[PDB]
Design a protein around this nucleic acid. Structure first.
Ligand code: ZN
Ligand code: ZN
Ligand code: ZN
Ligand code: ZN
Lengths: 234, 234, 234, 234
DNA sequence: AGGAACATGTCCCAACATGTTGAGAA
DNA sequence: CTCAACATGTTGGGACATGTTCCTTT
């Protein structure tokens, strides 16, 4: 009640920042990212690949930490955790405590923390350099609850904070993205981007006609992302 | 689960890449390759010839490893293995462990690895130069499970990664192709190449509103570029 | 797992049976009963009045027990309990254990049992005679979970069994009705009674062949005979 | 070893037979019996009990055997067990061996064991006299595998031998019915009755037009019910 | 407080998917 | 060694299910 985890973006000296795959919005997609809202839509307990980018390799012993907080200010001080139901269910993973919302997949060096003061949960992993011929590293997350789970997130939007820190635990970089765990990411995603379009519509716009639905959605995706970089330029 | 090995193409210092041009005559193969999908269609336990291309002769001790991973991101962290039924089968030649999906044929120097940290399976063979009169080295594989095997791949599409490495295991080159092990390769290939065609024969147009003159310029050219390349499907 | 308690109607020596005729005025109830389904629609934790009818006054020590079981046979063996979230709620009045779904209201003699052999839950109260001027005894229930509560009933229809017994617990009578705890009782009732109607109004003509002259007569004396008795919408 | 037991409808002095609740060819189900085929279509691990009926209720202690045997004149020797895949799947129920096809939940009297010589699988339960306020008995059946699982029944038909046997285990009854555990008991059921009735249909056949998809099923829940009561040619 | 208008998890079933079997082609 | 017909588990997404928000109403 006297300290909330900072969510201010910060590239730092290593140009740290995140990247995500490109997905559709079909009623079959299990995970899909919206550059228009910097928000990930994923089904319960399904893999969420997050790409980590760097301009220069960080010092030895650098770790990456994932932590979730509530987006709305009236809930910001409330620790995000699993609901009574899903909490009362153990998984093959004997590493992550049954109360943690975020898990890391395929990494036995992962470590789950319960802050003794803030009581906030978080999972940390060693920073690994990109594979030879690659420009980024990628971590695979999982969210063990539906944003709607009663007794848990209870329909409250959450934000995921990814920090890059050194052996001492000092901040080296930080980025973030919103998350919504739901039954149909495709549907929910289309709905939100649809409500966003019918809003910031004002001014002089050039018109480009595109052939094909897939090609169009890519062009539209790259377009809405650019309109975001401007949304907060001043 | 287990971390995901890189699947990014990397020709490296030797311009490493794969080829799939092996006639039907001589060792009448029942498999077939589709360049339109970069996917091979083969039957369970049947020879699959793959061509290795390199610009200059690699150093002494170079090897060639083969590893299979699940294509879809929600399965990428799961290790690709054989199904219980086929695993306990006696189709084992001794050299290859009963749990490996990928096998090398006609090479007694092949070594099968069951990683102790990533739990991933793979098979390695010493790199061999092309035959006198050829500019490529052939290698023969065998897939011990149907892509549909329950308990196994379970109808989940897989991707085979071929990496070139030095005696130590350092990456020198990498390439890959999709694989589907079925009972009727010819059929399944027609169907999939057919579904691919229908996907690029839909003439529906969409309009996009672009803000900023320069931006429009960039997007337009991007489109004209894809446009002046649409007329070639004949 | 747990054996399934009998749900067969048995009026017994006292002609025991239930009734659901309680006006809206006085204790304005938000629940509603559908005789066309013998199913009660009520909201979470809201009073549900039920009438007890008997031909002759029962012996001293007679009690009335209430037990809920899942309707569908594939769930019948699962004990009906509250969900984790609502179970840890503070809506507990003390008398009733936090895990019980069914509660008795306005009766401090009510006893809650958590069977040590069947693990089934139930609540009992001493049988009380009708009020001067009435031929039925009223009892008030409270359902502490929504039929949709995950971790709990999980959208699975339940059935409430009311049994009349002697001081020892021997069966003297039994009756029952279905129950659905939802947020909008009125709506859900209309929908279900509506789906019931459409089920008994289909107007598509199909064909049926027979291989006899006698037996045919029976299915002949009923066919063009049921299409007559329809003095409801004509 | 021995051989395959009888399956000739032999009620005996005590008489014996069973029954199944209402089951329509509607694909809106998870199980259904086709009297015109004597085949119990049911999904995987979905409880599907059968009614116990007996005129002269045998002496307490008597038991009802239930076994599975292939109806094909070549596999009748092979024991009916679970596929290698599902075998790994160790269900919570430790009462039934993780290799037995049949199960019976919510019944401590459940008996499971491997034959000492032939090494067969069987389940036996004590004939519980119709309890207070009833007239018959009901046991909860299951099938932990599909009739198509490879490494198991492998697309091979089976019969559930239900013979009432005294405490000792001496013959007393003999009833039976074929089973086809699948994923679509509805479709599958009709896809058989079709080709079934497709044969032998030349002669005097009256007509009858029934209006009402449900009524049609009602005139079928009796007419066809007499195709086993009137059709006594053999 | 009764009730459209959301918000959001499940279900239905016609495709679709895919190993079998078998008769015919070169 | 190719197709046609089957035999059979899985899927895609519109329809349905179901708690929540908030204006209009006694
Ligand atoms: Zn939850
Ligand atoms: Zn297999
Ligand atoms: Zn609840
Ligand atoms: Zn099986």
């Amino acid at each position: 009640s006297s300290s909330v985890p900072s969510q201010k973006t910060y590239q730092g000296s290593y140009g740290f920042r995140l990247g995500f795959l490109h997905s559709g919005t079909a009623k079959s997609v299990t995970c899909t990212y919206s550059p228009a809202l910097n928000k990930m839509f994923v089904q319960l307990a399904k893999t969420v690949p997050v790409q980590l980018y760097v301009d220069s390799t960080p010092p030895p012993g650098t770790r990456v930490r994932a932590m979730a907080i509530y987006k709305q200010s009236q809930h910001m001080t409330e620790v995000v955790r699993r609901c009574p139901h899903h909490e009362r269910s153990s998984d093959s993973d004997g590493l992550a405590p049954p109360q943690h919302l975020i898990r890391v997949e395929g990494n036995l060096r992962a470590e789950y923390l319960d802050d003794p003061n803030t009581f906030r949960h978080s999972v940390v992993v060693p920073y690994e350099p990109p594979e030879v011929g690659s420009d980024y590293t990628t971590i695979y997350f999982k969210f063990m609850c539906n944003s709607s789970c009663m007794g848990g997130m209870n329909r409250r939007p959450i934000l995921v904070i990814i920090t890059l820190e050194d052996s001492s635990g000092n901040l080296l970089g930080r980025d973030s993205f919103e998350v919504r765990v739901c039954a149909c990411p495709g549907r929910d995603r289309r709905t939100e981007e649809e409500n966003l379009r019918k809003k910031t519509m004002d001014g002089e716009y050039f018109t480009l006609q595109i052939r094909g639905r897939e090609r169009f959605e890519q062009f539209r995706e790259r377009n809405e992302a650019l309109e975001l970089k401007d949304a907060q330029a001043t």
